[PDB]
Amino acid sequence: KKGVVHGVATVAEKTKEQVTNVGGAVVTGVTAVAQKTVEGAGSIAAATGFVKKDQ
Amino acid sequence: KKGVVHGVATVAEKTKEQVTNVGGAVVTGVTAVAQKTVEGAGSIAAATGFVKKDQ
Amino acid sequence: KKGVVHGVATVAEKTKEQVTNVGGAVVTGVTAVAQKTVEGAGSIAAATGFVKKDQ
Amino acid sequence: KKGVVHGVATVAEKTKEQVTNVGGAVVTGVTAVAQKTVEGAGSIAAATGFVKKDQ
Amino acid sequence: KKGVVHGVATVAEKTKEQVTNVGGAVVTGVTAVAQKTVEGAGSIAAATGFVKKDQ
Amino acid sequence: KKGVVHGVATVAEKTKEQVTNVGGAVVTGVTAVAQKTVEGAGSIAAATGFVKKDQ
């Protein structure tokens, strides 16, 4: 076989799950948040997939 | 076989799930948030797939 | 077989789910939010697939 | 002060919440269930306040 | 002070929460269940307040 | 002071939380279950407050 890419690729065979992201966010897993009280300014309380920027 | 791409690709065979994103957000998983009180300015309380920018 | 693309592609066979997004948002999973009180200015309380920009 | 009861009582002062139950079920809290697939006969999948009897 | 009861009582002062139950079930807390696949016959998957009887 | 009871009592002062149960189940705390796959017949997967009987 042969494969040429520029990016971004995701090549496989017999694969159960695949995610390709250029961005950007993709949420595919089970996630449960139970919460009672959040205060303070400003607190990130429970972040699973998380990125942050400034300029 | 042969494969040429420029991006962004997602190639597979016999694959149960696939996500390709250029963006942008895609939510495909189970997610349950139960919450009672959120205060403070400004707090990200429970973020699963999350990105943030400024210029 | 052979495959040529410019992007963005999503090629597969025998695949249960596929999402291709250029944007933009696609919501395909189960999601339940139960909530009692949200205050503060301004707090993102429970975001699953989330992106944010400014210029 | 003085207090006589036979039951069932719930006496207090300066109290934010009170529940008195003879029964019977009372649901006062935040609850979020997100779910994708439930099978089997017969499975209790996610029970929070739960009682069960037979005779 | 003085207090006479037969049961079931719940006496207090300056109390934030109270529950009196004769039963029976009372759900007052935050609870979040996220779930993808439940099988088998029969499996209790995620039970928080739970009782079970037979005769 | 003086206190007479038959049961079941719960006497206090300056108390933040109280639970009296004759039963029966009371759920007052924060609880989050995230789960992907439950099989087998029959498996109790994640039980927090749990009792079980037979006759």
Coordinates of C-alpha atoms in Angstrom, one line a residue:
Chain A
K1 CA 0.0 0.0 0.0
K2 CA 0.9 3.7 -0.2
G3 CA -0.1 6.8 1.6
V4 CA 0.6 10.5 0.9
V5 CA -0.7 13.3 3.2
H6 CA -0.2 16.9 3.9
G7 CA -1.9 16.7 7.3
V8 CA -3.7 16.3 9.2
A9 CA -4.5 12.6 8.5
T10 CA -5.9 9.7 10.5
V11 CA -5.4 6.4 8.6
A12 CA -6.2 3.0 10.0
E13 CA -8.0 -0.2 9.3
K14 CA -10.3 -2.3 11.6
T15 CA -10.5 0.7 14.0
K16 CA -13.3 1.1 16.5
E17 CA -13.0 4.9 17.0
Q18 CA -11.3 7.8 15.3
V19 CA -11.2 11.5 15.9
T20 CA -9.5 14.1 13.8
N21 CA -9.7 17.7 15.0
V22 CA -8.3 21.0 13.8
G23 CA -9.9 23.6 16.0
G24 CA -11.7 23.1 18.1
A25 CA -13.3 20.5 20.4
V26 CA -14.7 17.0 20.1
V27 CA -16.4 15.2 23.0
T28 CA -17.0 11.5 22.6
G29 CA -16.7 10.0 26.0
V30 CA -19.0 9.6 29.0
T31 CA -18.9 12.5 31.4
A32 CA -20.9 13.2 34.5
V33 CA -20.6 16.2 36.7
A34 CA -22.4 16.6 40.0
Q35 CA -21.9 19.8 41.8
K36 CA -23.3 21.7 44.8
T37 CA -21.7 25.1 45.2
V38 CA -19.2 27.0 43.1
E39 CA -17.9 30.4 44.2
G40 CA -14.9 32.6 43.8
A41 CA -14.0 34.8 40.8
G42 CA -12.9 33.1 38.9
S43 CA -12.3 29.4 39.5
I44 CA -12.3 26.7 36.9
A45 CA -14.0 24.0 39.0
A46 CA -13.9 20.7 37.0
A47 CA -12.6 20.8 33.4
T48 CA -11.9 17.7 31.5
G49 CA -10.8 18.8 28.0
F50 CA -9.7 22.4 28.3
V51 CA -7.5 24.9 26.6
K52 CA -7.1 28.6 27.2
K53 CA -5.4 31.5 25.4
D54 CA -5.0 35.3 25.4
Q55 CA -3.3 37.9 23.3
Chain B
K1 CA -4.4 0.4 -2.1
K2 CA -3.5 4.1 -2.3
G3 CA -4.5 7.3 -0.6
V4 CA -3.7 10.9 -1.4
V5 CA -5.0 13.8 0.8
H6 CA -4.4 17.4 1.5
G7 CA -6.1 17.3 4.9
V8 CA -7.9 17.0 6.8
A9 CA -8.8 13.3 6.2
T10 CA -10.1 10.4 8.2
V11 CA -9.7 7.1 6.4
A12 CA -10.5 3.8 7.9
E13 CA -12.4 0.5 7.3
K14 CA -14.6 -1.5 9.7
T15 CA -14.8 1.5 12.0
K16 CA -17.6 2.1 14.5
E17 CA -17.2 5.9 14.9
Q18 CA -15.5 8.7 13.1
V19 CA -15.4 12.4 13.7
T20 CA -13.6 15.0 11.5
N21 CA -13.8 18.6 12.6
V22 CA -12.4 21.8 11.3
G23 CA -13.9 24.5 13.5
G24 CA -15.7 24.0 15.6
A25 CA -17.3 21.5 17.9
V26 CA -18.8 18.1 17.7
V27 CA -20.5 16.4 20.7
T28 CA -21.1 12.7 20.4
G29 CA -20.8 11.2 23.9
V30 CA -23.1 10.9 26.8
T31 CA -22.9 13.8 29.2
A32 CA -24.9 14.6 32.3
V33 CA -24.5 17.7 34.4
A34 CA -26.3 18.2 37.7
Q35 CA -25.8 21.4 39.5
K36 CA -27.1 23.4 42.4
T37 CA -25.4 26.8 42.7
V38 CA -22.9 28.6 40.6
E39 CA -21.6 32.1 41.6
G40 CA -18.6 34.2 41.1
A41 CA -17.7 36.3 38.1
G42 CA -16.6 34.5 36.2
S43 CA -16.0 30.9 36.8
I44 CA -16.2 28.1 34.3
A45 CA -17.9 25.5 36.4
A46 CA -17.8 22.2 34.5
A47 CA -16.5 22.2 31.0
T48 CA -15.8 19.0 29.1
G49 CA -14.7 20.0 25.6
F50 CA -13.6 23.6 25.8
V51 CA -11.4 26.0 24.0
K52 CA -11.0 29.8 24.5
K53 CA -9.2 32.6 22.7
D54 CA -8.8 36.4 22.6
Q55 CA -7.1 38.9 20.4
Chain C
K1 CA -8.9 0.9 -4.1
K2 CA -7.9 4.6 -4.5
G3 CA -8.9 7.8 -2.8
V4 CA -8.1 11.4 -3.6
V5 CA -9.3 14.3 -1.5
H6 CA -8.7 18.0 -0.9
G7 CA -10.3 18.0 2.5
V8 CA -12.1 17.7 4.4
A9 CA -13.0 14.1 3.9
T10 CA -14.4 11.2 6.0
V11 CA -14.0 7.9 4.3
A12 CA -14.9 4.6 5.8
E13 CA -16.8 1.3 5.4
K14 CA -19.0 -0.6 7.8
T15 CA -19.1 2.5 10.1
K16 CA -21.9 3.1 12.6
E17 CA -21.5 6.9 12.9
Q18 CA -19.8 9.7 11.0
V19 CA -19.6 13.4 11.5
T20 CA -17.8 15.9 9.2
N21 CA -17.9 19.5 10.3
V22 CA -16.5 22.7 8.9
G23 CA -18.0 25.4 11.0
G24 CA -19.7 25.1 13.1
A25 CA -21.4 22.6 15.5
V26 CA -22.9 19.2 15.4
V27 CA -24.6 17.6 18.5
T28 CA -25.3 13.9 18.2
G29 CA -24.9 12.5 21.7
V30 CA -27.2 12.2 24.7
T31 CA -27.0 15.3 27.0
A32 CA -28.9 16.1 30.2
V33 CA -28.4 19.3 32.2
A34 CA -30.3 19.8 35.5
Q35 CA -29.6 23.1 37.2
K36 CA -30.9 25.2 40.0
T37 CA -29.2 28.5 40.3
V38 CA -26.7 30.3 38.1
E39 CA -25.3 33.7 39.0
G40 CA -22.3 35.8 38.4
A41 CA -21.4 37.8 35.3
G42 CA -20.3 36.0 33.5
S43 CA -19.8 32.4 34.2
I44 CA -20.0 29.5 31.8
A45 CA -21.7 27.0 34.0
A46 CA -21.7 23.6 32.2
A47 CA -20.4 23.5 28.6
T48 CA -19.8 20.3 26.7
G49 CA -18.8 21.2 23.2
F50 CA -17.6 24.8 23.4
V51 CA -15.3 27.2 21.5
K52 CA -14.9 30.9 21.9
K53 CA -13.1 33.7 20.0
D54 CA -12.6 37.5 19.8
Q55 CA -10.9 39.9 17.5
Chain D
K1 CA -40.0 25.6 75.7
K2 CA -41.8 22.3 75.6
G3 CA -42.6 19.7 72.9
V4 CA -44.9 16.7 72.9
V5 CA -45.3 14.5 69.9
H6 CA -46.6 11.1 68.8
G7 CA -44.6 11.0 65.6
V8 CA -43.6 11.7 63.2
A9 CA -42.4 15.2 63.9
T10 CA -39.9 17.5 62.5
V11 CA -39.3 20.5 64.8
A12 CA -36.6 23.2 64.3
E13 CA -36.0 26.9 64.1
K14 CA -34.0 28.9 61.6
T15 CA -34.0 25.9 59.3
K16 CA -33.5 26.2 55.5
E17 CA -35.1 22.9 54.4
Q18 CA -37.3 20.3 56.0
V19 CA -38.9 17.1 54.8
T20 CA -41.2 14.8 56.7
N21 CA -42.4 11.7 54.9
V22 CA -44.6 8.8 55.8
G23 CA -45.0 6.8 52.6
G24 CA -43.9 7.5 50.2
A25 CA -41.4 9.6 48.3
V26 CA -40.2 13.2 48.2
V27 CA -37.7 14.5 45.7
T28 CA -36.2 17.9 46.4
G29 CA -32.7 17.8 45.0
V30 CA -31.1 18.4 41.6
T31 CA -30.9 15.3 39.5
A32 CA -29.7 14.7 35.9
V33 CA -29.7 11.4 34.1
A34 CA -28.2 11.0 30.7
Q35 CA -28.4 7.6 29.2
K36 CA -27.8 5.9 25.9
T37 CA -28.8 2.2 26.0
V38 CA -30.5 0.1 28.7
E39 CA -31.1 -3.6 28.1
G40 CA -31.4 -6.8 30.1
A41 CA -34.5 -8.0 32.0
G42 CA -34.5 -6.6 34.4
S43 CA -31.8 -4.2 35.4
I44 CA -32.3 -1.1 37.6
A45 CA -29.9 1.2 35.8
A46 CA -29.5 4.3 37.9
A47 CA -31.7 4.7 41.0
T48 CA -31.1 7.5 43.5
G49 CA -33.8 7.1 46.1
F50 CA -35.2 3.6 45.8
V51 CA -37.0 1.1 47.9
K52 CA -38.5 -2.2 46.9
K53 CA -40.8 -4.9 48.5
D54 CA -42.7 -8.0 47.8
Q55 CA -45.1 -10.3 49.7
Chain E
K1 CA -36.5 22.9 78.0
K2 CA -38.3 19.6 77.7
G3 CA -39.0 17.1 75.0
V4 CA -41.3 14.0 74.9
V5 CA -41.6 11.9 71.8
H6 CA -42.8 8.5 70.7
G7 CA -40.8 8.5 67.5
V8 CA -39.9 9.2 65.1
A9 CA -38.7 12.7 65.9
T10 CA -36.1 15.2 64.6
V11 CA -35.6 18.1 67.0
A12 CA -33.0 20.8 66.5
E13 CA -32.4 24.5 66.5
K14 CA -30.4 26.6 64.0
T15 CA -30.3 23.7 61.6
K16 CA -29.8 24.0 57.9
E17 CA -31.4 20.8 56.7
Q18 CA -33.6 18.1 58.2
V19 CA -35.1 14.9 56.9
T20 CA -37.4 12.6 58.7
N21 CA -38.5 9.5 56.8
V22 CA -40.8 6.5 57.7
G23 CA -41.1 4.6 54.4
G24 CA -39.9 5.4 52.0
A25 CA -37.4 7.6 50.2
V26 CA -36.3 11.2 50.2
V27 CA -33.8 12.6 47.7
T28 CA -32.4 15.9 48.5
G29 CA -28.8 15.9 47.2
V30 CA -27.2 16.6 43.8
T31 CA -27.0 13.5 41.6
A32 CA -25.8 13.1 38.1
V33 CA -25.7 9.8 36.2
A34 CA -24.1 9.5 32.8
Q35 CA -24.3 6.1 31.2
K36 CA -23.7 4.5 27.8
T37 CA -24.6 0.8 27.9
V38 CA -26.2 -1.4 30.5
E39 CA -26.8 -5.1 29.8
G40 CA -27.1 -8.3 31.7
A41 CA -30.2 -9.6 33.5
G42 CA -30.2 -8.3 36.0
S43 CA -27.6 -5.9 37.1
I44 CA -28.1 -2.9 39.4
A45 CA -25.7 -0.5 37.6
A46 CA -25.4 2.6 39.8
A47 CA -27.6 2.9 42.9
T48 CA -27.1 5.6 45.5
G49 CA -29.8 5.2 48.0
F50 CA -31.1 1.7 47.7
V51 CA -33.0 -0.9 49.6
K52 CA -34.4 -4.2 48.5
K53 CA -36.7 -6.9 50.1
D54 CA -38.6 -10.1 49.3
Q55 CA -40.9 -12.4 51.1
Chain F
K1 CA -33.0 20.3 80.3
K2 CA -34.7 17.0 79.9
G3 CA -35.4 14.5 77.1
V4 CA -37.6 11.4 77.0
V5 CA -37.9 9.3 73.8
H6 CA -39.1 6.0 72.6
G7 CA -37.0 6.1 69.5
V8 CA -36.1 6.9 67.1
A9 CA -35.0 10.4 68.0
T10 CA -32.4 12.9 66.7
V11 CA -31.9 15.7 69.2
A12 CA -29.4 18.5 68.8
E13 CA -28.8 22.2 68.8
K14 CA -26.8 24.4 66.4
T15 CA -26.7 21.5 64.0
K16 CA -26.1 21.9 60.2
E17 CA -27.6 18.7 59.0
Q18 CA -29.8 15.9 60.4
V19 CA -31.3 12.8 59.0
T20 CA -33.6 10.4 60.8
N21 CA -34.7 7.3 58.8
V22 CA -36.9 4.3 59.5
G23 CA -37.1 2.5 56.3
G24 CA -36.0 3.3 53.9
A25 CA -33.5 5.6 52.1
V26 CA -32.4 9.2 52.2
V27 CA -29.9 10.7 49.8
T28 CA -28.5 14.0 50.7
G29 CA -25.0 14.1 49.4
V30 CA -23.3 14.9 46.1
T31 CA -23.0 11.8 43.8
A32 CA -21.8 11.5 40.2
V33 CA -21.6 8.2 38.3
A34 CA -20.1 8.1 34.9
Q35 CA -20.2 4.7 33.2
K36 CA -19.5 3.1 29.8
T37 CA -20.4 -0.6 29.8
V38 CA -22.0 -2.8 32.3
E39 CA -22.5 -6.5 31.6
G40 CA -22.9 -9.8 33.4
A41 CA -25.9 -11.2 35.2
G42 CA -26.0 -9.9 37.6
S43 CA -23.4 -7.4 38.9
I44 CA -24.0 -4.5 41.2
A45 CA -21.6 -2.1 39.5
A46 CA -21.3 1.0 41.8
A47 CA -23.6 1.2 44.8
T48 CA -23.1 3.9 47.5
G49 CA -25.9 3.4 50.0
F50 CA -27.1 -0.2 49.5
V51 CA -29.0 -2.9 51.4
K52 CA -30.4 -6.2 50.2
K53 CA -32.6 -8.9 51.7
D54 CA -34.4 -12.1 50.8
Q55 CA -36.8 -14.5 52.6

